[PDB]
């Protein structure tokens, strides 16, 4: 029917059989850039407001603060210009400028910082802002915040589960925060009680998730690859219900990107090419020939004109 | 390029 706000809008995205990826059609993509702010942050923006707002944390009069640098400023953007509340994003300079662009656009207060140009200046220029008057700024901390999880635990999980008829086999999904992959593996093993692998897809270049889970020295590095591999293991991400990670380069995340676009006529996202890439690597083995893989499109190509995708 | 936390 119809929507209070746009925040009331977000999820139920559809279900894509890929064509040229997997074998004979076990692969198929969650396109999450069909959501208000065209981004899978969109439910994650929506229920950390929401969840700010029963808790009493979230008030009129009291300023949203974040550091995100990604798709969850565009997010809590909409969600806060939907509902009447300020919002001020810190973030140096400036990957991506449409990222930059849209954000203005909502009418967030960018604060523009730069340590070495990075999240330690971003996330510390935040902490400042929220020490004056404290009870006026609100840090939604969406690396550590259990509403981020949680509306992926009830959205799009089940949405996973509702539209496979139960027949998902595999989830893959790349983290950032780790909500995806925490809430949807949650949903699908716990409240459905199906034993699904649940795949995490990390940057080669920086895969402090793989480092650590083998014991090995954590050397996070620089990529190309937007909206994954944070350098660090965020506290959203839940690693006991993680059953695989797979790392993917720069490259053949982008080169997946623009072989999705030009062979699937789907617009994705890098990230997306991430994810499609492990996904695509785990189908043409024997052991996942025949199941059903489910794979996360977080963005849209069009958040990345001014990157190398284009 | 991205590290700790850019981009998401
Ligand atoms: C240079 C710096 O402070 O590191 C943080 C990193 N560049 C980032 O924004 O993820």
Known sequence: ?310 | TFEYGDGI
Not at chain 1, 92 to 119: D, Q, W
Not at chain 1, 280 to 306: G, H, M, N, Q, T
Request: hydrophobic letters at 40%; one cysteine or more; aromatic letters at 4%.
């Open chain 1, 1 to 310: 029917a119809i929507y209070a706000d746009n925040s009331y809008s977000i999820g139920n995205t559809p279900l894509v059989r890929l064509k040229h990826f997997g074998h004979n059609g076990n692969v198929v993509v969650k396109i999450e850039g069909r959501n208000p702010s065209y981004s899978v942050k969109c439910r994650i923006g929506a229920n950390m407001v929401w969840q700010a707002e029963k808790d009493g944390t979230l008030t009129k009069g009291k300023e949203i603060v974040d550091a995100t640098s990604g798709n969850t400023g565009i997010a809590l953007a909409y969600v806060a210009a939907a509902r009447g509340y300020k919002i001020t994003l810190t973030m140096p300079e400036t990957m991506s400028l449409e990222r930059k662009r849209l954000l203005c656009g909502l009418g967030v207060n960018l604060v523009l910082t730069e340590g070495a140009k990075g999240m330690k200046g971003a996330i510390a220029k935040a902490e400042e802002i929220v020490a004056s008057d404290p009870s006026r700024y609100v840090m939604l901390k969406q690396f550590e915040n259990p509403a981020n999880p949680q509306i992926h635990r009830e959205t799009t999980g089940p949405e996973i589960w509702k539209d496979t008829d139960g027949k998902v086999d595999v989830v893959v999904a790349g983290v950032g925060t780790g909500g995806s992959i925490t809430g949807i593996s949650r949903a699908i093993k716990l409240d459905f009680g199906k034993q699904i692998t649940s795949v995490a897809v990390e940057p080669v270049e920086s895969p402090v998730i793989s480092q650590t889970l083998a014991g090995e020295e954590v050397k996070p590095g620089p990529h190309k690859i937007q909206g994954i591999g944070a350098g660090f293991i965020p506290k959203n991400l839940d690693l006991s219900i993680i059953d695989r990670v797979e790392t993917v380069d720069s490259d053949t995340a982008l080169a997946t990107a623009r072989r999705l676009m030009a062979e699937e006529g789907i617009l994705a996202g890098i990230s997306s090419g991430a994810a499609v890439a492990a996904a695509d690597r785990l189908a043409k083995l024997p052991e996942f020939a025949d199941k059903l893989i489910v794979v996360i499109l977080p963005s849209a190509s069009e958040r990345y004109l001014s990157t190398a995708l284009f």
